[PDB]
């Protein structure tokens, strides 16, 4: 757990710059050789900077590090959507005794295109229905920014019982995914004319519908 103090969040617009500070003490940052790491959902952590200022293999010159005494700074210029990530600083603590990481900073890159969600609704399988259960699955992809709201309907009634919805998770591309599950008895599935998943994103709604008369 965190030792070096970093801002929990920073933002900058596309093509612009942002700085992340990393505040320690004489026992860590003050002894120098600060490093920085980038963590993006799909990937292993990636070393960006070491020795306060040196760029690691494959790291472009728009990532720069500096240090003054007990504070180190990472600056990212020419911001791109692909730079959205959690950034962590680190250093040796009391030399070879220990190493300490910072508290981490989430970078948001402003000015990206709005992207509405793609919605797929799957009815229960025959196999699940044979166990007298029915799960409806609503899969929501490729949306930006990363905030949706999901409503379930049956024959025009809003349903909330036995709905489970995930948080939005940042994809391979700065866009987001989420899923929502409606758990029914096979009895309840067969007793309605239709079920819908209604997904709202930035004021716009996409609705998909499945009908027991047409499915499973």
């Amino acid at each position: 757990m965190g030792c070096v103090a970093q801002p929990s969040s920073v933002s900058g617009s596309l093509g612009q710059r942002v700085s992340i500070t990393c505040s320690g003490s004489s026992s860590n940052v003050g002894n120098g050789y600060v490093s920085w790491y980038q963590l993006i959902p799909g990937s292993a952590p990636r070393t960006l900077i070491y020795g306060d200022t040196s760029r690691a293999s494959g790291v472009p010159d728009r990532f720069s590090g500096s240090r003054s005494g007990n504070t180190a700074t990472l600056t990212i210029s020419s911001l791109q959507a692909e730079d959205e990530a959690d950034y962590f600083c680190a250093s040796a603590e009391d030399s070879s005794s220990n190493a300490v990481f910072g508290s981490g900073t989430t970078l948001t890159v402003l000015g990206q295109p709005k992207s509405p969600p793609s919605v797929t609704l799957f009815p229960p399988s025959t196999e699940e229905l044979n166990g007298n259960k029915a799960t409806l699955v609503c899969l929501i992809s490729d949306f930006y920014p990363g905030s949706v709201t999901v409503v379930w309907k049956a024959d025009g009634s809003t349903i909330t019982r036995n709905v489970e919805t995930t948080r939005a998770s940042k994809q391979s591309n700065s866009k987001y995914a989420a899923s929502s599950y409606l758990s029914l008895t096979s009895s309840d599935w067969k007793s309605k004319g239709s079920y819908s998943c209604e997904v709202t994103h930035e004021g716009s709604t996409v609705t998909k519908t499945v009908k027991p008369s047409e499915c499973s």
Binding site: Y33, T47, F88, E128, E164, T165, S179, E214
Partner: protein, 267 residues
């Protein structure tokens, strides 16, 4: 270097967690190999390392529960952590670690054996200047100081990380059900198929389609966790047979589930 962590996905509380890191790739240097973890929602935490001389170093907060060893012949480094609790649930990464005591000279001092024009005898000094005024032709003619030792640590290359859950709940293999949207979207240019990976413990599962033959247009979603404590996730593909390959290492189970479009209705 490539690093691969191996070990259990689920460990009983109060037992010993044991992981292995296997290093592969075209060469190796003097890097130590170490372990870092990250709990969900939390910062990175150092565990420890072992260097090429066999020196171990541990996070002092965990030293009493940790043992890091290596086996050069198998290109493997191991970590054991005793008496685990749910607070030890995390992603565990092994990593190559640069660990180096540097000899540093102060500002303004030279360290090479180029003593300057007309000068000699600077070579046995750590850090020197010829600044008195004239030539320096003896070690005692230079301003000199012993180098200061300064210690550098950083992580060079990281593994992908292995998820470890510390829980008293039982390993539970998933129920895998085939999904198809065609009975709903009526689209015949494209078909959207999927698999529901229902009710399992612990994370993770791996999903492929057609044994890796179908990769483009696959989207495997993050699991939901119910209050019951079992996970479900789904994988979809937009498109011949189609089969999802679901592996759950924790249960030694693999299901290859045929996914037929099933566009019709049987009344």
């Amino acid at each position: 270097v490539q690093l691969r962590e191996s070990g259990p996905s689920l460990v009983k509380p109060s037992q010993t967690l044991s992981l292995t890191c296997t290093a592969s790739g075209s060469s190796l240097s003097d890097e130590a190999v170490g372990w870092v973890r990250q709990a969900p929602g939390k910062s990175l935490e150092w565990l420890g390392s072992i260097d090429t001389g066999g020196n171990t170093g541990y996070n002092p907060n965990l030293k009493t529960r940790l043992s890091i060893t290596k086996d050069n012949s198998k290109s493997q480094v191991s970590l054991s952590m005793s008496s685990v609790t749910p607070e030890d649930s995390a992603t565990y990464f092994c990593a190559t670690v640069h660990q180096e005591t540097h000899q540093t000279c102060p500002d303004g001092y030279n360290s090479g054996d180029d003593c300057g024009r007309g000068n000699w005898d600077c070579g046995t000094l750590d850090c020197w200047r010829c600044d008195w005024g004239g030539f320096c032709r003896a070690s005692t003619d230079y301003r000199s100081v012993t180098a200061t030792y300064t210690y550098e640590w950083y992580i060079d290359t990281w593994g992908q990380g292995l998820l470890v859950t510390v829980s008293s709940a039982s390993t539970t293999a998933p129920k895998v059900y085939p999904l198809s949207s065609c009975c709903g979207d009526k689209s015949s240019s494209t078909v959207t198929l999927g698999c529901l990976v229902s009710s399992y413990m612990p994370e993770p599962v791996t999903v492929t389609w057609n044994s890796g033959a179908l990769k483009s247009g696959v989207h495997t979603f993050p699991a939901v966790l119910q209050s019951s404590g079992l996970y479900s996730l789904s994988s979809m593909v937009t498109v011949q047979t189609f089969t999802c390959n679901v592996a759950h290492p924790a249960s030694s189970t693999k299901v290859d589930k045929a996914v037929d479009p099933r566009c019709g209705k049987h009344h």
